Design a protein around this ligand. Sequence first.
Ligand SMILES: O=C(O)[C@H]1O[C@H](O[C@@H]2[C@H](O)[C@@H](O)[C@@H](O[C@@H]3[C@H](O)[C@@H](O)[C@@H](O[C@@H]4[C@H](O)[C@@H](O)[C@@H](O[C@@H]5[C@H](O)[C@@H](O)[C@@H](O[C@@H]6[C@H](O)[C@@H](O)[C@@H](O)O[C@@H]6C(=O)O)O[C@@H]5C(=O)O)O[C@@H]4C(=O)O)O[C@@H]3C(=O)O)O[C@@H]2C(=O)O)[C@H](O)[C@@H](O)[C@H]1O
Length: 342
Amino acid sequence: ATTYNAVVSKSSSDGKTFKTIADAIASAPAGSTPFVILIKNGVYNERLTITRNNLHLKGESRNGAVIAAATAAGTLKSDGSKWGTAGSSTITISAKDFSAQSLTIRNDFDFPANQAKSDSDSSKIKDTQAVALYVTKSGDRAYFKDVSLVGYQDTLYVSGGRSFFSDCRISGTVDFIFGDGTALFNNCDLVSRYRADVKSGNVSGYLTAPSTNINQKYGLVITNSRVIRESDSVPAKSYGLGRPWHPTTTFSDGRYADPNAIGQTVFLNTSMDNHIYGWDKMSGKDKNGNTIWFNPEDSRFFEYKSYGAGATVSKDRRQLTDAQAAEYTQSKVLGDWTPTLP
Ligand SMILES: O=C(O)[C@H]1O[C@H](O[C@@H]2[C@H](O)[C@@H](O)[C@@H](O[C@@H]3[C@H](O)[C@@H](O)[C@@H](O[C@@H]4[C@H](O)[C@@H](O)[C@@H](O[C@@H]5[C@H](O)[C@@H](O)[C@@H](O[C@@H]6[C@H](O)[C@@H](O)[C@@H](O)O[C@@H]6C(=O)O)O[C@@H]5C(=O)O)O[C@@H]4C(=O)O)O[C@@H]3C(=O)O)O[C@@H]2C(=O)O)[C@H](O)[C@@H](O)[C@H]1O
Protein backbone atom coordinates (compact mmCIF):
# COMPACT_ATOMS: atom_id res chain seq x y z
CA ALA A 1 0.00 0.00 0.00
CA THR A 2 2.81 2.43 -0.95
CA THR A 3 0.67 5.48 -1.87
CA TYR A 4 1.98 9.06 -2.09
CA ASN A 5 0.73 12.10 -0.17
CA ALA A 6 2.15 14.52 -2.76
CA VAL A 7 3.64 14.25 -6.27
CA VAL A 8 6.27 16.61 -7.70
CA SER A 9 6.84 16.85 -11.47
CA LYS A 10 8.11 19.18 -14.20
CA SER A 11 4.93 18.74 -16.27
CA SER A 12 1.95 20.97 -15.49
CA SER A 13 -0.07 18.54 -17.64
CA ASP A 14 0.66 15.83 -15.05
CA GLY A 15 -2.41 16.40 -12.87
CA LYS A 16 -2.51 17.69 -9.29
CA THR A 17 1.30 17.81 -8.98
CA PHE A 18 3.58 20.34 -7.28
CA LYS A 19 6.11 22.21 -9.44
CA THR A 20 8.77 22.31 -6.70
CA ILE A 21 9.77 19.90 -3.90
CA ALA A 22 9.55 22.78 -1.41
CA ASP A 23 5.87 23.30 -2.36
CA ALA A 24 5.08 19.59 -1.94
CA ILE A 25 6.71 19.56 1.51
CA ALA A 26 4.71 22.70 2.33
CA SER A 27 1.45 20.81 1.65
CA ALA A 28 2.22 18.32 4.46
CA PRO A 29 -0.05 18.54 7.52
CA ALA A 30 1.66 19.89 10.66
CA GLY A 31 3.07 17.39 13.16
CA SER A 32 4.73 13.99 12.85
CA THR A 33 2.45 11.73 10.80
CA PRO A 34 4.28 10.03 7.89
CA PHE A 35 4.35 12.15 4.72
CA VAL A 36 5.62 10.60 1.49
CA ILE A 37 6.45 12.66 -1.60
CA LEU A 38 7.05 11.22 -5.07
CA ILE A 39 9.54 13.31 -7.06
CA LYS A 40 9.25 12.65 -10.79
CA ASN A 41 12.32 12.67 -13.07
CA GLY A 42 13.85 16.12 -13.53
CA VAL A 43 16.51 18.43 -12.18
CA TYR A 44 15.19 20.44 -9.25
CA ASN A 45 17.31 23.50 -8.47
CA GLU A 46 16.40 23.83 -4.80
CA ARG A 47 18.10 24.07 -1.44
CA LEU A 48 16.17 22.39 1.40
CA THR A 49 16.29 22.37 5.21
CA ILE A 50 14.11 19.55 6.56
CA THR A 51 12.49 20.45 9.90
CA ARG A 52 9.43 18.16 9.78
CA ASN A 53 9.85 14.77 11.48
CA ASN A 54 8.76 11.61 9.62
CA LEU A 55 9.22 13.07 6.11
CA HIS A 56 9.98 10.74 3.16
CA LEU A 57 11.13 11.53 -0.37
CA LYS A 58 11.08 9.03 -3.18
CA GLY A 59 12.47 9.88 -6.61
CA GLU A 60 11.21 8.21 -9.79
CA SER A 61 14.77 6.99 -10.43
CA ARG A 62 18.21 7.62 -8.95
CA ASN A 63 19.52 8.52 -12.44
CA GLY A 64 16.71 10.91 -13.33
CA ALA A 65 15.39 12.53 -10.15
CA VAL A 66 17.90 15.15 -9.03
CA ILE A 67 18.02 17.80 -6.29
CA ALA A 68 20.83 20.24 -7.08
CA ALA A 69 22.30 23.61 -6.08
CA ALA A 70 25.75 25.16 -6.33
CA THR A 71 27.11 26.67 -3.11
CA ALA A 72 30.64 26.68 -1.73
CA ALA A 73 31.60 27.61 1.84
CA GLY A 74 33.25 30.70 0.32
CA THR A 75 30.19 31.70 -1.74
CA LEU A 76 28.95 35.08 -0.48
CA LYS A 77 25.38 35.87 0.58
CA SER A 78 23.58 39.24 0.32
CA ASP A 79 25.17 40.64 3.50
CA GLY A 80 28.52 39.73 1.88
CA SER A 81 29.37 37.06 4.47
CA LYS A 82 30.34 33.44 3.73
CA TRP A 83 27.89 30.51 3.78
CA GLY A 84 30.52 28.35 5.50
CA THR A 85 30.79 24.56 5.27
CA ALA A 86 27.57 23.69 7.15
CA GLY A 87 25.83 26.59 5.34
CA SER A 88 26.93 25.36 1.89
CA SER A 89 24.72 22.26 1.96
CA THR A 90 22.15 21.58 -0.79
CA ILE A 91 20.04 19.50 1.61
CA THR A 92 20.14 19.87 5.40
CA ILE A 93 18.40 17.31 7.68
CA SER A 94 17.31 18.84 10.97
CA ALA A 95 14.43 16.48 11.78
CA LYS A 96 14.04 12.83 12.78
CA ASP A 97 12.97 9.75 10.80
CA PHE A 98 13.76 11.26 7.41
CA SER A 99 14.20 8.98 4.43
CA ALA A 100 15.16 9.52 0.81
CA GLN A 101 15.01 6.77 -1.83
CA SER A 102 15.88 6.53 -5.55
CA LEU A 103 17.14 10.10 -6.09
CA THR A 104 20.34 12.14 -6.43
CA ILE A 105 21.48 15.07 -4.27
CA ARG A 106 24.23 17.30 -5.69
CA ASN A 107 26.31 20.26 -4.86
CA ASP A 108 27.04 21.67 -8.31
CA PHE A 109 29.86 23.95 -7.17
CA ASP A 110 32.35 23.53 -10.00
CA PHE A 111 35.47 22.80 -7.99
CA PRO A 112 37.74 22.01 -10.98
CA ALA A 113 36.68 25.17 -12.85
CA ASN A 114 37.31 27.15 -9.63
CA GLN A 115 40.80 25.63 -9.27
CA ALA A 116 41.61 26.33 -12.94
CA LYS A 117 41.03 30.08 -12.36
CA SER A 118 44.03 32.42 -12.26
CA ASP A 119 45.30 33.18 -8.75
CA SER A 120 44.60 36.89 -9.33
CA ASP A 121 40.97 36.14 -10.31
CA SER A 122 38.86 37.72 -7.54
CA SER A 123 36.02 35.21 -8.13
CA LYS A 124 38.31 32.23 -7.35
CA ILE A 125 37.05 30.79 -4.06
CA LYS A 126 39.51 29.61 -1.40
CA ASP A 127 36.93 27.99 0.91
CA THR A 128 36.13 25.19 -1.52
CA GLN A 129 34.07 22.87 0.67
CA ALA A 130 30.64 22.42 -0.91
CA VAL A 131 28.29 20.04 0.89
CA ALA A 132 25.65 18.03 -0.97
CA LEU A 133 24.00 16.54 2.11
CA TYR A 134 24.25 17.53 5.75
CA VAL A 135 22.63 15.38 8.42
CA THR A 136 22.62 17.48 11.60
CA LYS A 137 22.47 16.65 15.33
CA SER A 138 18.70 17.17 15.03
CA GLY A 139 18.45 14.56 12.27
CA ASP A 140 18.68 11.20 14.10
CA ARG A 141 17.46 8.09 12.26
CA ALA A 142 18.04 9.38 8.71
CA TYR A 143 17.83 6.69 5.99
CA PHE A 144 19.05 6.93 2.38
CA LYS A 145 18.34 3.98 0.03
CA ASP A 146 19.50 3.94 -3.60
CA VAL A 147 20.62 7.54 -3.26
CA SER A 148 23.47 9.27 -5.06
CA LEU A 149 25.45 12.05 -3.38
CA VAL A 150 27.54 14.26 -5.68
CA GLY A 151 30.29 16.73 -4.82
CA TYR A 152 34.02 17.28 -4.55
CA GLN A 153 35.27 18.58 -1.19
CA ASP A 154 33.07 17.67 1.82
CA THR A 155 30.28 15.96 -0.12
CA LEU A 156 28.60 14.33 2.90
CA TYR A 157 28.52 15.91 6.36
CA VAL A 158 27.22 13.53 9.02
CA SER A 159 26.78 14.92 12.53
CA GLY A 160 25.17 13.85 15.79
CA GLY A 161 22.87 10.89 15.50
CA ARG A 162 22.52 7.78 13.41
CA SER A 163 22.26 7.61 9.65
CA PHE A 164 22.14 4.63 7.27
CA PHE A 165 23.12 4.68 3.58
CA SER A 166 22.14 1.63 1.51
CA ASP A 167 22.81 0.76 -2.18
CA CYS A 168 24.26 4.23 -2.49
CA ARG A 169 26.75 6.22 -4.59
CA ILE A 170 28.86 8.92 -2.98
CA SER A 171 31.49 10.85 -4.90
CA GLY A 172 34.10 13.38 -3.93
CA THR A 173 37.69 14.37 -3.42
CA VAL A 174 38.76 15.75 -0.04
CA ASP A 175 37.06 14.51 3.17
CA PHE A 176 33.94 13.58 1.21
CA ILE A 177 32.44 11.69 4.15
CA PHE A 178 33.07 13.70 7.28
CA GLY A 179 31.70 14.47 10.72
CA ASP A 180 31.01 13.03 14.16
CA GLY A 181 27.79 11.10 13.46
CA THR A 182 27.16 7.37 13.52
CA ALA A 183 26.89 6.70 9.81
CA LEU A 184 26.61 3.18 8.40
CA PHE A 185 27.15 2.58 4.67
CA ASN A 186 26.19 -0.75 3.13
CA ASN A 187 26.59 -1.86 -0.49
CA CYS A 188 27.73 1.62 -1.56
CA ASP A 189 30.00 2.84 -4.34
CA LEU A 190 32.41 5.41 -2.90
CA VAL A 191 33.86 7.19 -5.88
CA SER A 192 37.19 9.04 -5.67
CA ARG A 193 37.26 11.79 -8.28
CA TYR A 194 39.98 12.99 -10.66
CA ARG A 195 41.93 16.12 -9.67
CA ALA A 196 43.37 18.21 -12.50
CA ASP A 197 44.88 20.64 -9.98
CA VAL A 198 47.00 18.08 -8.08
CA LYS A 199 50.58 17.39 -9.23
CA SER A 200 51.81 13.87 -9.96
CA GLY A 201 52.94 12.32 -6.66
CA ASN A 202 50.69 14.45 -4.43
CA VAL A 203 47.52 13.42 -2.58
CA SER A 204 44.23 13.88 -4.44
CA GLY A 205 41.93 13.28 -1.49
CA TYR A 206 40.54 11.39 1.48
CA LEU A 207 37.39 9.29 1.59
CA THR A 208 36.65 10.07 5.24
CA ALA A 209 37.44 12.67 7.88
CA PRO A 210 35.71 11.46 11.01
CA SER A 211 35.42 13.70 14.06
CA THR A 212 33.80 11.01 16.24
CA ASN A 213 34.04 11.81 19.96
CA ILE A 214 36.25 9.31 21.81
CA ASN A 215 33.35 8.32 24.12
CA GLN A 216 31.10 7.49 21.15
CA LYS A 217 31.16 3.79 20.27
CA TYR A 218 30.54 4.08 16.51
CA GLY A 219 31.60 6.62 13.88
CA LEU A 220 31.84 5.97 10.15
CA VAL A 221 31.20 2.30 9.39
CA ILE A 222 31.52 1.06 5.81
CA THR A 223 30.33 -2.48 4.96
CA ASN A 224 30.07 -4.65 1.80
CA SER A 225 31.00 -1.65 -0.34
CA ARG A 226 33.21 -0.67 -3.24
CA VAL A 227 35.90 1.98 -3.02
CA ILE A 228 36.45 2.91 -6.67
CA ARG A 229 38.07 5.52 -8.89
CA GLU A 230 35.96 7.79 -11.09
CA SER A 231 38.34 7.25 -14.05
CA ASP A 232 41.61 5.61 -15.11
CA SER A 233 43.23 9.07 -14.72
CA VAL A 234 42.87 8.82 -10.93
CA PRO A 235 46.46 7.82 -10.05
CA ALA A 236 47.53 4.80 -8.00
CA LYS A 237 48.14 5.64 -4.32
CA SER A 238 46.47 9.08 -4.55
CA TYR A 239 43.67 8.67 -1.98
CA GLY A 240 43.60 8.12 1.78
CA LEU A 241 40.91 6.01 3.45
CA GLY A 242 40.62 8.64 6.14
CA ARG A 243 42.39 11.34 8.12
CA PRO A 244 41.49 12.47 11.69
CA TRP A 245 39.33 15.61 11.72
CA HIS A 246 39.56 17.42 15.06
CA PRO A 247 37.12 20.30 14.48
CA THR A 248 37.79 23.82 15.66
CA THR A 249 35.65 23.99 18.79
CA THR A 250 35.04 26.60 21.51
CA PHE A 251 36.11 25.57 25.01
CA SER A 252 36.45 27.44 28.32
CA ASP A 253 40.18 27.95 27.57
CA GLY A 254 39.77 29.13 23.95
CA ARG A 255 38.79 28.03 20.43
CA TYR A 256 40.91 25.28 18.83
CA ALA A 257 41.05 21.71 17.42
CA ASP A 258 39.00 19.35 19.65
CA PRO A 259 41.48 16.95 21.38
CA ASN A 260 38.69 14.43 22.05
CA ALA A 261 37.38 14.20 18.49
CA ILE A 262 39.32 10.97 17.89
CA GLY A 263 37.50 9.78 14.79
CA GLN A 264 36.48 6.27 13.84
CA THR A 265 36.42 4.88 10.29
CA VAL A 266 35.95 1.12 9.87
CA PHE A 267 35.85 -0.73 6.53
CA LEU A 268 34.45 -4.29 6.52
CA ASN A 269 34.34 -6.67 3.52
CA THR A 270 34.90 -3.74 1.16
CA SER A 271 36.70 -3.74 -2.20
CA MET A 272 39.36 -1.09 -2.84
CA ASP A 273 41.08 -0.17 -6.11
CA ASN A 274 44.76 0.80 -6.09
CA HIS A 275 44.10 4.55 -5.89
CA ILE A 276 44.05 3.81 -2.13
CA TYR A 277 47.39 4.13 -0.30
CA GLY A 278 46.18 3.77 3.31
CA TRP A 279 45.41 6.17 6.13
CA ASP A 280 46.80 9.67 6.71
CA LYS A 281 47.31 12.45 9.28
CA MET A 282 45.59 15.83 9.49
CA SER A 283 46.65 19.13 11.04
CA GLY A 284 44.80 21.69 13.15
CA LYS A 285 45.58 24.51 15.59
CA ASP A 286 46.03 23.72 19.28
CA LYS A 287 45.11 25.78 22.39
CA ASN A 288 48.26 27.90 21.97
CA GLY A 289 47.70 28.69 18.29
CA ASN A 290 50.40 26.24 17.14
CA THR A 291 50.15 23.68 14.37
CA ILE A 292 49.30 20.25 15.77
CA TRP A 293 49.19 17.00 13.78
CA PHE A 294 46.67 14.26 14.46
CA ASN A 295 47.98 10.88 13.44
CA PRO A 296 46.10 7.86 11.99
CA GLU A 297 47.76 5.41 14.42
CA ASP A 298 46.21 7.45 17.27
CA SER A 299 42.77 7.31 15.67
CA ARG A 300 40.17 4.56 15.37
CA PHE A 301 41.06 3.50 11.81
CA PHE A 302 40.44 -0.19 11.02
CA GLU A 303 39.76 -2.65 8.22
CA TYR A 304 38.30 -6.14 8.08
CA LYS A 305 38.85 -8.37 5.04
CA SER A 306 39.36 -5.59 2.47
CA TYR A 307 40.02 -6.84 -1.06
CA GLY A 308 41.13 -5.58 -4.45
CA ALA A 309 44.39 -3.91 -5.41
CA GLY A 310 44.14 -1.17 -2.72
CA ALA A 311 43.80 -3.70 0.10
CA THR A 312 47.19 -4.04 1.76
CA VAL A 313 47.64 -5.45 5.19
CA SER A 314 50.51 -3.81 7.03
CA LYS A 315 51.39 -2.34 10.43
CA ASP A 316 50.02 1.00 9.20
CA ARG A 317 46.72 -0.67 8.32
CA ARG A 318 45.26 -2.25 11.44
CA GLN A 319 42.90 -5.19 11.03
CA LEU A 320 39.96 -6.32 13.14
CA THR A 321 39.79 -9.85 14.49
CA ASP A 322 36.72 -11.92 13.56
CA ALA A 323 35.39 -11.27 17.10
CA GLN A 324 35.97 -7.53 16.71
CA ALA A 325 34.22 -7.56 13.31
CA ALA A 326 31.04 -8.99 14.88
CA GLU A 327 30.75 -5.68 16.78
CA TYR A 328 30.07 -3.88 13.47
CA THR A 329 26.79 -5.51 12.43
CA GLN A 330 23.93 -3.21 11.45
CA SER A 331 22.08 -4.14 14.69
CA LYS A 332 25.01 -3.08 16.87
CA VAL A 333 25.96 0.09 14.95
CA LEU A 334 22.35 1.39 14.71
CA GLY A 335 21.17 0.14 18.13
CA ASP A 336 17.39 0.26 18.66
CA TRP A 337 16.72 1.74 15.18
CA THR A 338 15.81 -0.49 12.26
CA PRO A 339 15.81 1.63 9.07
CA THR A 340 12.50 1.20 7.24
CA LEU A 341 10.90 2.87 4.23
CA PRO A 342 7.23 3.92 4.28
O1 LIG B 1 29.51 23.38 16.88
C1 LIG B 1 29.21 23.56 15.67
O2 LIG B 1 28.25 22.97 15.12
C2 LIG B 1 30.04 24.52 14.86
O3 LIG B 1 29.57 24.56 13.50
C3 LIG B 1 30.31 25.43 12.62
O4 LIG B 1 31.32 24.56 12.07
C4 LIG B 1 32.06 23.62 11.29
C5 LIG B 1 33.11 22.92 12.15
O5 LIG B 1 32.52 22.28 13.29
C6 LIG B 1 34.18 23.92 12.60
O6 LIG B 1 35.19 23.25 13.36
C7 LIG B 1 34.81 24.59 11.38
O7 LIG B 1 35.50 23.78 10.42
C8 LIG B 1 36.49 24.07 9.42
C9 LIG B 1 35.94 23.78 8.02
O8 LIG B 1 34.74 24.50 7.79
C10 LIG B 1 35.69 22.28 7.82
O9 LIG B 1 35.28 21.99 6.46
C11 LIG B 1 36.95 21.51 8.17
O10 LIG B 1 37.97 21.79 7.20
C12 LIG B 1 39.08 20.92 6.96
C13 LIG B 1 40.39 21.65 7.29
O11 LIG B 1 40.48 21.97 8.69
C14 LIG B 1 40.53 22.90 6.41
O12 LIG B 1 41.82 23.50 6.59
C15 LIG B 1 40.38 22.53 4.94
O13 LIG B 1 41.44 21.70 4.43
C16 LIG B 1 42.57 22.06 3.62
C17 LIG B 1 42.18 22.06 2.13
O14 LIG B 1 40.98 22.82 1.91
C18 LIG B 1 42.01 20.64 1.58
O15 LIG B 1 41.87 20.69 0.15
C19 LIG B 1 43.23 19.80 1.94
O16 LIG B 1 44.43 20.02 1.17
C20 LIG B 1 45.52 19.46 0.41
C21 LIG B 1 46.49 18.72 1.33
O17 LIG B 1 45.80 17.71 2.07
C22 LIG B 1 47.21 19.71 2.26
O18 LIG B 1 48.21 19.02 3.03
C23 LIG B 1 47.86 20.85 1.46
O19 LIG B 1 49.03 20.38 0.77
O20 LIG B 1 46.93 21.46 0.54
C24 LIG B 1 46.26 20.56 -0.37
C25 LIG B 1 45.30 21.31 -1.25
O21 LIG B 1 45.01 22.50 -0.97
O22 LIG B 1 44.80 20.72 -2.24
O23 LIG B 1 43.42 19.80 3.35
C26 LIG B 1 43.73 21.10 3.90
C27 LIG B 1 43.98 20.99 5.37
O24 LIG B 1 44.13 19.85 5.87
O25 LIG B 1 44.05 22.04 6.06
O26 LIG B 1 39.18 21.77 4.72
C28 LIG B 1 39.08 20.56 5.47
C29 LIG B 1 37.85 19.82 5.02
O27 LIG B 1 37.34 18.92 5.75
O28 LIG B 1 37.37 20.13 3.90
O29 LIG B 1 37.39 21.84 9.50
C30 LIG B 1 37.71 23.22 9.73
C31 LIG B 1 38.16 23.44 11.16
O30 LIG B 1 38.30 22.46 11.90
O31 LIG B 1 38.37 24.61 11.55
O32 LIG B 1 33.79 25.20 10.56
C32 LIG B 1 32.72 24.35 10.11
C33 LIG B 1 31.76 25.20 9.34
O33 LIG B 1 30.63 24.74 9.03
O34 LIG B 1 32.14 26.36 9.03
C34 LIG B 1 30.31 26.86 13.16
O35 LIG B 1 31.10 27.70 12.31
C35 LIG B 1 30.84 26.88 14.59
O36 LIG B 1 30.79 28.20 15.14
C36 LIG B 1 30.02 25.93 15.46
O37 LIG B 1 28.67 26.42 15.57
